[PDB]
Symmetry: D2
Subunit: 309 residues, 4 copies
């Protein structure tokens, strides 16, 4: 298997806290937070670790929050390659409400990057050897022009780095601007925005995915469909995989778990069907766990065996 | 095609109202309500009308609220057969919040039924011809012992009335106590309560469904799975049908729409596959319409065509 | 003491129910409701009963819901004078959420009145002897022109009936159109709407209340101020009364409790200070009790003793 | 006028963000946060600046978040005296929901303080001149034994530093353990916890306040009562001051604004009446401004003039 790297331009040090009730105006007393790594590529690398593989997470880190982020990943045995940034690593908030069992997730932008910090990040990316896989996942932080992301991807592909993309909005469109992306995983909202049209008819998702493949923007499009599983599209195949009928406890982290799983199958040169099935297995495995916990090896294996008959 | 009847032991006259915001403590000023028919069997009959068929709704009605319920169904051209009850027809409340677009649904028990009234309802059911279909759908109202529900179904079956059951809790178990039910449609929670175990493993739903068929309790079990569609089980077949990837606007009425569709297919003596496909098409068609609106013929046809492609 | 009557043109049979959690989209299973009398004048009469006096509630009642409303008042020993109405007595909903202890209150319009039913109600009102007190409290139901309310009040005053008004919006303005109202109790929002201006400066409430008295619209204006108590205004006096610093459990019914209390003091020809103090005592006593329960005699007496030094 | 200092053992760098709707499970996309100074003593110092006075804020600051906190105060021209702490300055989150206009406030503990750092803070406090005022306001951060808070206050008082305390829980009791506190401002809940009993009777708050004065624990006790204003108690006087009837826009910052105002009055050696009046004026002035904004000079002056009329 070739080596796997992930890139998170907007990582975070997330706080998970608990409060008895939720209501406006008054002070909600919240417990001492538990800190956890945040960010698309970072969680993809964590999911891969859970599944028994290894992925090196590349990301900017700033201030004491950044140091703690790196410290957390060290304890989880997730290898990293960081760039020191001036602006401190930002924090998102996850609140569990004890009385209802509900969770609330407040997602703010990542820290700013200056041009020099982005250049260092690109330098880290270009140290990746030909044939290896790079997963670019997450939002685009302030300070980065859209074309800089496209230029990074182009440079990467130029020296044989195989790119996988999970993003949204203008970043996702920009990441796909040059094309030849190995794999992209939009969810339904992300797909609709990317093809710039509403997907209201039964066959619209399939057709939109095929449109992306046919255009040369991506070799593989896996449209993830929440509880309905996913639809994977190749130049030769269209397959839908639906998860088993088991209740979701918490959907947080399903997307990153699926991407990490599919990345591993891509590294193994698996078939489209095997890739999508393993992706659904890990994404749905993620839903079995409370709060922000990602997929576990054993749950993913169990669901994958079910999906494989 | 044989004739179709439905039975709703706990009907309601539902109020749909609108308010700008939702918050506790203060008076929420709600608009003058729009009244609509409520109740499982009643909604099955309405869905059947939408799909081009005809079903007679049997139910107790009491007071001016009951009169209005009857009048609403007359205006919708749904045939009825009623028993006048002493306790007035109860009301559930549907609240649309303008600021969020969210809907809140407060579901209270149906009016009480005395023993005389239940025997009157039983008399109506036993006037149904042999070979016709009776759909018993909805909650069990106060005043009716579970044994009486068992007795009604046993009485109906002895003379060739084909029974379809959609209920929950002790009522569902009681309805299946006699066995030889033509079709039962539990959702996942209802199936779990019926077999009395958590269904936490991938194959648990299928195994539970097969257990009910094998035990002779039901000829067909269709476990409905929300956005995952449904799993249909026979003595000979097992199929899962997943809806197309279209966004749900409002899930209200999905269950009764699905039951209405499957009932029509059952009356046409369709295959298990055709029955479940049409059921999923109608159930998911219902979700395309806002609020409490059930499935439309055209949306159901479109989804069914896709599933049958 | 002279006799006391209340008029409720829009009464209701309210349902109080309990549900474990509150959230949109899904069915919220609510307990078998406890029915209670609803409507301004009706609750004023109930509050008066709690305080040891007697008030006859005049109101339209229709259908089985109306009969149960009358039945509830009989059990509480509240004398009534009803007019049978064609349109059935409507229901508001009070929902207690067990997990949070919050209550939600959905308030819909009252049943319609036709011209004949209103004429009968006016006839009941004009049977009231000179010197007696009539409390007109609550919203204006559909079917009643604004000037009909004004004409009723004018006719009442013409034969010596002393009128007290608690209402809002166009109804309140109309009720005050002719003037010489003995007592009106707007809250702050109601006062602002009545004088048609925002009350943003420290002395604005006082000035607005005095404007109403000086105009001849009302002899006494008691602006109720929620937790801040009330400001009472006469042609000769301006007094603010603030409740004791005890936590409110539930504010439902505070307004009607205050009005019933003030009505009793008006019947005793009490001073403005005594009237307002007893009103604050009963209104704040109401807040000590969970849900919709009105003021208790003992709590009101205790707070009144405190307010009187 | 003597000099004024404040002490905030648990400061914060607060993030204020905006999101369109609030609901659980999904990612709530929040705007790039606006940062603001947080913490009891810090806010007291800011309120004092608004009211035209000057107060030096003493607090631990750590990391880039602490640097930003210090920078924000510099921009607001609030003098500070800081101790560099190992643990980085923590962040609370204020969320405005656009659809409802509601604000949600998630309050987490302050950064940890080690024993060395606390002694450094103690050293700063003991550099305050005799006769000057020190306001100790806010929660107690992890790492500080209650006895150390008692020791700090005892140390300060021995050399003529006049101490004002605003806190809660065990910290408030510990702060009052030494006695001879110049002024304490519990709210109702804080007073109840302090005297360890429910305050359910009309005179309970006053009696509890007098108990603290009589015991020698505090020279002055001002129990703040939210919209009911405040009750101020001396060895010689007892007064209640109620704000004018103006609608609160947002209650955030009322407490610290009130403390800032009373501190300034205390420095001017004002009467108990003048102190409580100005306190209520500033507290209520704070409520006129949206979000976390404290009292403005002009609004405070306007309310104070009314209270003094
Ligand atoms: N259980 C609740 N449900 C809904 N709203 C609440 C609830 N508790 C408090 N609130 C709201 O919060 C406001 C203040 O509540 P609270 O008694 O906690 O004071 P606080 O200012 O938040 O905290 P503190 O005691 O530290 O001063 C109330 O006015 C109310 O609007
Ligand atoms: N409610 C659910 N029940 C079962 N499986 C789910 C559920 N939601 C997500 N999954 C699984 O996780 C996979 C990915 O989730 P989804 O399609 O929601 O992507 P995403 O929106 O990009 O995730 P995320 O919000 O974490 O970024 C799905 O394809 C599916 O396998
Ligand atoms: N927009 C809102 N968001 C959250 N809570 C609210 C909102 N509006 C009102 N409330 C709550 O409802 C209580 C009263 O609100 P409101 O001003 O509507 O008075 P009311 O008693 O409900 O009605 P009325 O004016 O008829 O007397 C407030 O104390 C507050 O707790
Ligand atoms: N979120 C959804 N998206 C797409 N289709 C749906 C969704 N929810 C329900 N359906 C369709 O409706 C059918 C029945 O709905 P479901 O499985 O939820 O039954 P139910 O819980 O008995 O419904 P109900 O609550 O109305 O009684 C499903 O099998 C599916 O076809
Ligand atoms: N604890 C909860 N918090 C927030 N939302 C919930 C919660 N429980 C259910 N919901 C919402 O209600 C929808 C359906 O929930 P549920 O499992 O109760 O099915 P139902 O259609 O309401 O009832 P039924 O079992 O009778 O078919 C869910 O899709 C979810 O959106
Ligand atoms: N939160 C509270 N705390 C203490 N007393 C209260 C509170 N709210 C109301 N009261 C008492 O009840 C009296 C009337 O309540 P309020 O001023 O809110 O009138 P209202 O809005 O017309 O009441 P309602 O909504 O029931 O019709 C007040 O003057 C006061 O004495
Ligand atoms: N307007 C809403 N009201 C109530 N709940 C909502 C609303 N929008 C989303 N949700 C809840 O959040 C879940 C996911 O919402 P959403 O479409 O935003 O996906 P997401 O996972 O939060 O974000 P993303 O598109 O980045 O993957 C839904 O399943 C639903 O439960
Ligand atoms: N809803 C309100 N309306 C008018 N004035 C208010 C209101 N709430 C607070 N105030 C003013 O602010 C002063 C202090 O507020 P409060 O009694 O709530 O203290 P607190 O609970 O310590 O404040 P905080 O939660 O900010 O720390 C009050 O005495 C009063 O003057
Ligand atoms: K999870
Ligand atoms: K619908
Ligand atoms: K009450
Ligand atoms: K404010
Ligand atoms: Mg995603
Ligand atoms: Mg998602
Ligand atoms: Mg159902
Ligand atoms: Mg359901
Ligand atoms: Mg009122
Ligand atoms: Mg009110
Ligand atoms: Mg405070
Ligand atoms: Mg407070």
């Amino acid at each position: 298997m070739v080596r796997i790297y992930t890139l998170t331009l907007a990582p975070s040090l997330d706080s998970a806290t608990i409060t008895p009730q939720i209501y406006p105006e008054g002070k909600l007393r919240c417990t001492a937070p538990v800190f956890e790594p945040g960010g698309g590529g970072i969680n993809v690398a964590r999911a891969i670790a859970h599944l028994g593989g290894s992925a090196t997470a590349i990301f900017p880190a700033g201030g004491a929050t950044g140091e703690h982020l790196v410290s957390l990943l060290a304890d989880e045995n997730v290898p990293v390659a960081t760039v020191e940034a001036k602006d401190w690593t930002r924090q998102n908030l996850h609140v569990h409400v004890e009385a209802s069992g509900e969770q609330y997730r407040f997602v703010m932008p990542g820290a700013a990057l200056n041009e020099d910090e982005f250049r260092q990040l690109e330098e880290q990316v270009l140290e990746i050897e030909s044939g290896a896989i790079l997963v670019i996942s997450g939002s685009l932080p302030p300070g980065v022009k859209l074309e800089k992301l496209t230029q990074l991807i182009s440079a990467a592909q130029k020296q044989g780095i195989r790119c996988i993309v999970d993003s949204s909005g203008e970043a996702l469109s920009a990441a796909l601007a040059i094309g030849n992306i190995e794999l992209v995983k939009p969810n339904q909202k992300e797909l609709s925005a990317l093809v710039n049209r509403e997907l209201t008819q039964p066959d619209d998702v399939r057709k939109a995915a095929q449109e992306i493949v046919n255009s040369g923007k991506a070799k593989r499009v896996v449209v993830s469909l929440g509880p309905q599983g996913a639809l994977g599209v190749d130049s030769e195949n269209c397959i839908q995989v639906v998860p088993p009928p088991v209740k979701s406890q918490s959907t947080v982290g399903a997307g990153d778990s699926m991407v990490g799983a599919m990345t591993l199958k891509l590294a193994e040169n698996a078939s489209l069907e095997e890739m999508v099935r393993f992706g659904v297995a890990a994404g749905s495995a993620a839903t079995l766990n409370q709060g922000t916990r990602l997929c576990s090896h054993d749950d993913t294996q169990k669901i994958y065996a079910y999906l494989s008959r």
